[PDB]
Amino acid sequence: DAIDDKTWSKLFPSIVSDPDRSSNFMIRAIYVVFSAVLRQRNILEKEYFSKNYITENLSCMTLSFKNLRAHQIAQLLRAAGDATKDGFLKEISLVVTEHDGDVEAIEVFSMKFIYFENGGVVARLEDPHFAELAQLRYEGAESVRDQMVTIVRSVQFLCTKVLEPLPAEFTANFRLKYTNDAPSNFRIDGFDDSSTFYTLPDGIQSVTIGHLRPGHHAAHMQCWSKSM
C-alpha cells in the first residue's frame, strides 16, 4: 500500500497509512490546495508562486519559499497543518470580504477535518458532510492520490470556468476554528484570536470541491461564493 511516482513524491509522502504520514499528507494538502486557490482566483500575482506537479500530467502553482511574503503565508498554512497532528484543527478557510475585517464573506474556500481513532477507523465526536465523511474508510494510498488529483482539477476548473472574477477590491483572509479538544494554552502561530469566524448570505450558493481520506484523517473541501 504505497504510491510509486517520482512526481508525487516531490510534494507528498508515498505512504499515508500510518498516523504521522497521514497527518503529514494533510499538511502538504493544505499547502497545495490553498496555494492553487490563491493563484487561480488571482488573489496573489503569479510571481509569488512556482510551478509544481501533482502528476506528470497535472500541474499546479505552489507558494514560493524564495519570496518572503509568499514564504510567510506558507508557514501560516504549515502552522495550521501542524495542528492536525494533535487533532486541534476543526476547519481552516480562505475568506474573501469586501472590506478588511468583515465577518460576512463573499467567497469562502473551507477545508473541514475529521480525526479518526483506533486504527484510523472510528471518528472522534450537524455539518451536512460529517455523517457521510465519518463513515468513509481509508481505501489505500492510490485512492488518496486520486482524491488529491480530483480536488486540484476541480479547483482549477471551478476558479477559471465556473466562478465569475472576484471584484476589483477585496480582502482575502485565512480563518480557522479550533477543536474542542484543543486546550486554552494552545495557539496556532500567525492567527490572532477572535470570538467571530465568518458568516454567509442566506442566498449564497455552495459547491462540493472534494474530500480527502488518508490513514487517520479526513478533509472536506467546499466553496461558498457570490461569484458562482
Binding site: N173, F191, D192, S194, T196
Partner: peptide, 14 residues
C-alpha cells in the same frame, strides 16, 4: 498567553 475564543484569523491581503 491563554486563549478563550474558538476562532483565529490572520493577515490579510487587500
Amino acid at each position: 498567553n491563554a486563549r478563550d475564543s474558538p476562532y483565529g484569523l490572520s493577515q490579510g491581503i487587500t
